[PDB]
Amino acid sequence: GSDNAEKGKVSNDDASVDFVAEPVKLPENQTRVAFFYDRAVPIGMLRPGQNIESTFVYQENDLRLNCLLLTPLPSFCPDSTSGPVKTKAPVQWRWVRSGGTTNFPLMTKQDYAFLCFSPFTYYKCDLEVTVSALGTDTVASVLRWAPTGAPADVTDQLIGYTPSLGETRNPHMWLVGAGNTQISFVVPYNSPLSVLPAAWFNGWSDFGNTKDFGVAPNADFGRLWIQGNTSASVRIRYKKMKVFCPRPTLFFPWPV
Amino acid sequence: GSDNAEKGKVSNDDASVDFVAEPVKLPENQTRVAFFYDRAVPIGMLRPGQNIESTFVYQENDLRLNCLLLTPLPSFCPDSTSGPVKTKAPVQWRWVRSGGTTNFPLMTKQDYAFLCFSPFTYYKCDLEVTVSALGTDTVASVLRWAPTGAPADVTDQLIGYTPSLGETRNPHMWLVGAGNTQISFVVPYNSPLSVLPAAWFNGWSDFGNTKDFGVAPNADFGRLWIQGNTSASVRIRYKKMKVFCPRPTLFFPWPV
Amino acid sequence: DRVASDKAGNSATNTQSTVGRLCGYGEAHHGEHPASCADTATDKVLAAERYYTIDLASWTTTQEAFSHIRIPLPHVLAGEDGGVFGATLRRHYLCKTGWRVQVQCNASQFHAGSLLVFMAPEFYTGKGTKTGDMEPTDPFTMDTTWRAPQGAPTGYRYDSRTGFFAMNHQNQWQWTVYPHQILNLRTNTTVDLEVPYVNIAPTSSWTQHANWTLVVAVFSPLQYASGSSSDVQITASIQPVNPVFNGLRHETVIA
C-alpha cells in the first residue's frame, strides 16, 4: 500500500499485505546467476585457411576466420576507416555488425544471448570451450590455444609437412580419424584484471588516451587458432560465474 | 641500496628496503622446473619408407625419415664432408640446420623450445612420447622402439607379407583400423649416464679423441622406427624432470 | 528528522527536507590500501576530504522525460574545483576512492516535476564522434547541456554507420536499478547518495578511466503556473570518500 519512492526504495510486498490474502511462494533455484549462465552457447565458428601440413596464416573468407577471440563481447578483424583489416587476428569490437545488406548474418562474433541479457556491470568465471565439426569427412585437425595477452607466435613451420600451430609449448590439441570429431575443454580465468566488463569500459585503452575507448585491455579469455581439413562451430560456457554491480539490460523494441 | 657485487653476490631486495613501502608478493607455483617442462612439444615427424607387409629400410625424403632419435637436441642422418649420409639412422648433431636456402624448414630435428630455453647444464627425466597421424586414411601402422645404445636389428623380414619392425622382443606397437590413429606412451630414463647434457659435452666421444667432440655418448632416450601407410607428427614430454648447474640461455638478437 | 547536516573537514552541507541517505551496494569506501601497489600510500588528507560544491544545471519546462546530464569521476574534480584533492590526484599514477554526494534543487509547493538522481559504474560519458579517428569526444568532461534520450536506446557507434547496437548502450527504462534516489518537487529539495569503490582493478589509473558517473535525469517535466518563480537551478555537493593515492610522480598536466 502507501509509501515513498523518493528515498531510493520501497516496500516489496506480497498479496497478504493490503488484503485478506497470503503468501503463495514455493521453493525454487533455477534463477541463480551461476546455474543460469552455466550452459553452452555458440559465439562463432572456425574455418581453416590451411592444411594440417603447412604453415598457418591468418585467413578470412565470407566473414569466416581461421582464428577466434574468446569473449562474449563482439569481435572481428580490427576495423579501419578503410574497412576491417582481414590479414589480422580478431579483436574486441564496440558494437555488433551485419555481415552485409540485410541484418543477418553478422560480420561480428559474440554471445548474442549474453549481450541481450547481462543484467550486470562486471563479471568473472572460468570458460568451458567446445569445438564441434560442421562437416562429415574423416577429420584431420589441429587447434591451438593461448591466454589473453600472449604472443600469437604465428611464425613459420619448423618441421616440414607438419602443422605450424602444433609447434608450441602452449596448450594445443590434435584431432584425427574417423569418428573423432569434437574438441572439448576448460580454461581458467586468465586475465590480468580482477574482474571483466560485461559490456562497457568507460575509459581509454592507451596511456595517450587516443585509442579504443570503451574497451578494457586483456578483457578476454585468450584465443584459438585452427588448421587442418575441418570447419567447426565454436561454443562457450560460463563456469562458476560471478557477477557484480547490477545494470540495465539491452533495450527491447516497443510494439508499433 | 648500497652493496658490493665483487664478492660474487648481492642483496636481493624488494621495495620496502630503501623506501617507505612493502612486499607485494603472492603465492604462485607455475614457475617450477618440473611443472613447466611437463608439457608436450613436437621434435620432428615420421614418414614410412615402406608398407606394413615388407622389410624395413632406412629411408629419407625431403628431409623426412622413417626413423627418429629421441632427444631434445638436434639430430639427423650423420653428416659428412660430402653431405649427410641418408642411408643411415639419425644421430645427434652439434648444431641446427636449414633444410635449404631460406631458414625454414629445418633439415634437423629437435625440441626448438627446449633449445631456446634450457637454463641449465645437465638434466634428467623420463620421456613421454606421442605419435599423431598427419593423414586421414584408414591407418595400418607399426612402430618399434629401443633404448639408447641397443642394436637397430634393421634386418630382413622373417615371415613373408608382414612387417620386419614387428619382429622383435623389443617394445613395439601395432595400430590399425578406422578411427585408430594415435600412439601414446612413456619410456624410462634409459641412459648409461647418471645425467644428460642439456646442451654441450666438452669432451671427445672416442678414446682416441678424434671424433664427435661436444657430444656425449648414449646421451638420448633411444629411438623410433616406423613402417606402414601413415606419416606422423612426433612429440615429446619431460616427465619428472630434474635440472642441475645453471647456465646461460640461447642468445636473443638485439633490436637494430 | 527531515532536517539534517553533514560535515566534512572545513565544509558542511545542510537540508530541511531530506529523505535519507541511500548507500549503494549497501557499503562504503573504507580507504584500504591496494594490494597491487608496493609503495606506502598517501591517504587521510583532511584538506582533500570534504565537499566540493558546484553547479550542475538549469532545469526548464522544455526538458522532457529522460533528458539528462552526466558527471564523470573523479575527472570533474581533477582540476581546479577539486582544490587539494584534485591537486594531489594530478600528481599520482593511481587513485582509489568512493563518493558521497548531495544533489540540490528547490522549487515550491506550486511547482510540479521530478528528477532521477543516480550513480552508475562504467556509464557512457562520451559526447560525440570524433571526425577522423572513429572514437568518442570528451569522455571525461561533464555535460554542459541537457542530453536528449534515445527513443531506442541502442548506444553510439563511431564507424558512422547504423544498425544493431553499441556496447555503450544505456537503457533508461531501467535506470532505477542503479543506486539512486528521486528528487520530487512536492517532497524534497535534496537527495543524498553514497557509493563504494568499484572497478576492473584493485586501484585505478584515473588519468584514463572515469569508473563512476553521477547522473541527473528528468522523470516528469518541470511545470509551473505563470507568476510562479520560473528560474530553477540544480547544484551539487560532491565529496571524495577516503581517497587513497599511490605512485607519486611529476604532475599530470590536466590543465
Partner: peptide, 25 residues
C-alpha cells in the same frame, strides 16, 4: 551452485579443474 549434477565429480583434482581462488589481502 552451478549447472553440475554428477556424484563421482572429482577425477581431475580441484586445483586443476578450476582456477584457484585466492585473496590479495
Amino acid at each position: 551452485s552451478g549447472n553440475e549434477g554428477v556424484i563421482i565429480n572429482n577425477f581431475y583434482s580441484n586445483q586443476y579443474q578450476n582456477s584457484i581462488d585466492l585473496s590479495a589481502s
